């Protein structure tokens with residue numbers, strides 16, 4: 001969200017290889033497993049009682065894919081995150097009441113999932129670009145609380 | 147930084163009564179006392195070894211007044227924090243390397259100091275307005291790290 | 293961390309709070325619900341209006357639990373064990389929220405005891421509210 | 434918190450890290466210096482280039498201290514007591530920074546042990562890095 005045109009190119013090239021359902025379902029499940037208070041927003045998803053209930057709930061995978069597809073949209077509009085997520089910014093503040101800190105936890109869990117899936121291709125420099133993207137997204141969702 | 151015209155009026159009315167040196171010196175000293183790692187940015191101020199050295203160092207009071215005068219400027223330009231602090235945003239990121247989290251600690255220590263000085267005049271509603279102002283300032287100083 | 297000097301400041305400061313602990317706990321909730329409205333989310337069943345009897349009743353419980361913790365600084369984990377279960381398992385309170393309430397309680401103490409709320413006392417009380425917040429979110433992670 | 438199950442996951446996971454702890458500690462610093470450049474501020478005297486011998490040497494020290502902590506989960510405060518003094522009094526490391534390094538170390542472990550880095554193991558390792566971070570910033574507040 002202030003990247004070189006080559007960093008941006010590296011970011012987009014990795015996103016060509018992101019399976020949004022596999023990565024999204026895993027990122028959301030790990031969030032719910034690792035930061036347990038995040039489960040209170042997803043009462044309606046049913047059994048979220050242990051890591052296996054969580055990683056296998058079809059409701060988690062489908063919501064993870066929706067969250068990730070939306071993230072993929074901010075990746076394709078890095079020069080305009082603020083407007084890409086305004087409406088999403090009001091849903092989370094107004095209707096969901098999610099603390100903005102959770103946007104940062106999810107962004108980092110996403111980064112850990114990309115590392116797990118891409119291994120050594122997910123170099124330190126590529127990770128640094130992605131930290132700017134997840135922070136760019138976390139601040140545009142957090143833009144309507146401010 | 148998204149206030150009613152009456153909340154804004156209450157904010158400005160309190161600022162008419164703020165002694166920027168007394169409040170600024172106290173806010174900065176309490177920051178340095180309460181969150182000790184913040185002392186590494188102020189090595190050049192000399193003895194910061196105990197609460198009395200800290201609250202009485204003339205360098206702390208003068209810097210607290212400068213910080214507070216600048217805050218008073220964002221209070222008088224609430225419709226434009228982002229531009230009021232851009233240059234200050236680059237100094238802290240680029241030259242000082244201050245983590246943005248410290249802007250939030252200072253804003254809250256400032257609020258605790260206003261409470262101490264105004265007592266029961268510093269009502270729960272007035273405090274809520276001030277939390278929007280300190281967050282508004284903390285995000286405009288943090289605007290150039292993002 | 294809670295060093296002897298911090299334990300001495302916290303006991304002395306809480307002796308000055310004396311019998312206003314519940315009234316300060318109620319005022320702190322109020323400043324928290326007005327300054328950080330996402331917090332209101334954990335209290336659907338309360339009447340949160342200024343002066344609601346429920347908030348006042350809950351302000352007394354919070355005030356008493358702090359007065360208990362002040363009596364057991366050497367062992368907060370056992371004194372607050374039962375409150376860890378409730379906040380972690382039953383309420384799923386987001387940890388950021390203990391910070392907001394701690395801030396609101398310091399603000400309230402600055403309002404009412406300006407002369408006793410010195411920089412060294414403010415530093416010890418912050419460490420104390422941080423220790424209490426850690427015990428209450430311990431049952432999570 | 435470090436429950437027996439968390440202690441069992443952390444010991445098992447660190448046995449799989451085995452002899453790469455120093456090389457993983459060096460890679461984690463590198464990802465931290467590139468992703469969160471304000472951190473570079475505590476290391477003026479280092480050559481931070483990719484492959485600097487200093488970073489590699491410091492990656493080994495960090496890796497060994499984690500391997501020591503894994504051996505003393507029941508008592509991190511005494512095993513890391515000497516490191517608390519250094520980070521709090523001598524280096525004045527901003528606590529936010531332990532979080533960034535913890536994140537970078539989890540990222541590095543996800544890169545190298547993808548099959549062992551399961552959700553339950555990721556959760557236990559996060560709690561562990563959080564406990565280690567708390568001990569190292571304890572001498573502050």
Ligand code: HEM
Pocket residue numbers: 038041042066067068070071088091092096098102103106107137141
């Ligand atoms: C990367 C940051 C995030 C992005 C891009 C994102 C995006 C989205 C999107 C696209 C939806 C669907 C909204 C609709 O179509 O009505 C959604 C809904 C929702 N999100 Fe977020 N989200 C993010 C972070 C979070 C976090 C951290 C939480 C809570 C811990 C959260 C909780 C929810 C909930 C509870 C809903 C509504 C669920 C439902 O419809 O069943 N989100 N989000």
Ligand code: HEM
Pocket residue numbers: 184187188212213214216217234237238242244248249252253283287
């Ligand atoms: C309310 C948020 C803050 C505001 C409005 C603010 C404002 C200012 C201003 C007006 C100056 C003078 C710059 C110049 O004239 O060159 C300054 C300098 C500085 N500030 Fe900030 N500041 C804030 C927060 C912080 C924090 C949290 C820290 C560190 C923990 C910090 C550390 C410094 C330092 C080290 C300098 C340069 C000191 C010197 O010239 O001796 N500031 N700040």
Ligand code: HEM
Pocket residue numbers: 331334335350353354357358375379383385389390393394424425428
């Ligand atoms: C200093 C920190 C805190 C202390 C000492 C504390 C103490 C307590 C106590 C003593 C109870 C009463 C349980 C009973 O009556 O059995 C309670 C209940 C509760 N607290 Fe906490 N509390 C703290 C912070 C928080 C925070 C930050 C929140 C959320 C923002 C919160 C939300 C709740 C809720 C929702 C309940 C149940 C209330 C009811 O339904 O009556 N508390 N707390």
Ligand code: HEM
Pocket residue numbers: 472475476491494495498499516520524526530531534535565566569
């Ligand atoms: C998991 C967390 C950490 C562990 C286990 C750890 C461990 C260590 C160890 C074992 C030493 C070496 C002391 C010696 O050689 O006597 C050290 C030194 C040091 N660490 Fe930490 N560290 C941690 C996090 C951090 C963080 C987050 C920073 C700052 C961003 C940091 C900055 C330093 C510095 C500046 C030194 C002195 C290095 C030198 O001059 O050689 N450390 N650390």
